[PDB]
Design a binder for this molecule. Structure first.
Ligand SMILES: Nc1ncnc2c1ncn2[C@@H]1O[C@H](COP(=O)(O)OP(=O)(O)O)[C@@H](O)[C@H]1O
Ligand code: ALF
Ligand SMILES: [Mg+2]
Length: 53
């Protein structure tokens, strides 16, 4: 995970970042459709922080 976050991703989010990164580096787009309140707003920040770090 990007150390830039000053935060910890949960298990179900860290694998979710890997999905986000894999689609990005393979040049394709996707839907993060997780159930409400699971933290989709957080996984969103984590992929930007990866593109930064
Ligand atoms: N890894 C995490 N560490 C701390 N708080 C988290 C984490 N993931 C989610 N949250 C908390 O979950 C709450 C709701 O998540 P949010 O992403 O807004 O739901 P939604 O997926 O509807 O956007 C937020 O206040 C956020 O602080
Ligand atoms: F349940 Al949400 F943004 F997906 F509040
Ligand atoms: Mg949201």
């Amino acid at each position: 995970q990007p150390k830039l976050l000053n935060c910890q991703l949960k298990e179900y989010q860290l694998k979710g970042l890997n999905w986000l990164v894999n689609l990005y580096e393979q040049g394709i787009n996707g839907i993060l459709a997780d159930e409400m309140g699971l933290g989709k707003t957080v996984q969103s920040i984590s992929v930007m922080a990866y593109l930064a770090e």
